[PDB]
């Protein structure tokens, strides 16, 4: 479905940014996507996610396997879904006002396979 949105929007599946969150099962890969502060190693490169937006802001940002990562990666996306703002390691804001954020998991898959029958969509 995410590749279907990318194909609808951009005439291509991989004209997008997929960042699979199973790679980020530790905490500190927050610094992989938002960058590193002044002083430290990868300062002059930027975060991957912020630069990948900063080229082509009208895009689709995909997060997959969201149950794999540590729970406190998701202060970054608190900023993101509050204002579309994100501040990389050099300290400039990156506008996410033209982005779509999709997060997938398999949380209640036992419960969904158990009770999708004989139940409404709502409850």
């Amino acid at each position: 479905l995410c590749k279907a949105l990318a194909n609808f929007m951009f005439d291509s599946d991989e004209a997008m940014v997929r960042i699979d969150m199973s790679e980020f099962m530790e905490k500190h890969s927050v610094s992989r996507l938002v960058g590193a502060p002044p002083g430290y190693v990868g300062y002059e490169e930027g975060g991957y996610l912020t630069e990948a937006v900063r080229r082509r802001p009208y895009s689709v940002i995909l997060l997959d396997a969201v149950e794999k990562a540590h729970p406190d990666v998701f202060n970054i996306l608190l900023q993101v879904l509050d204002d579309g703002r994100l501040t990389d390691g050099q300290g400039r804001t990156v506008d996410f006002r033209n982005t779509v954020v999709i997060m997938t998991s398999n949380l209640g898959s036992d419960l969904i396979q158990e009770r999708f029958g004989e139940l409404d969509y709502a409850h």
Partner: peptide
């Protein structure tokens, strides 16, 4: 009767930059 002109003689220097590292 020429006089040797004193020059301007533009120069050059450089500067490195360290990088610390966390150690997890």
């Amino acid at each position: 009767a020429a006089a040797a002109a004193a020059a301007a003689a533009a120069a050059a220097a450089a500067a490195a930059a360290a990088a610390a590292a966390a150690a997890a």
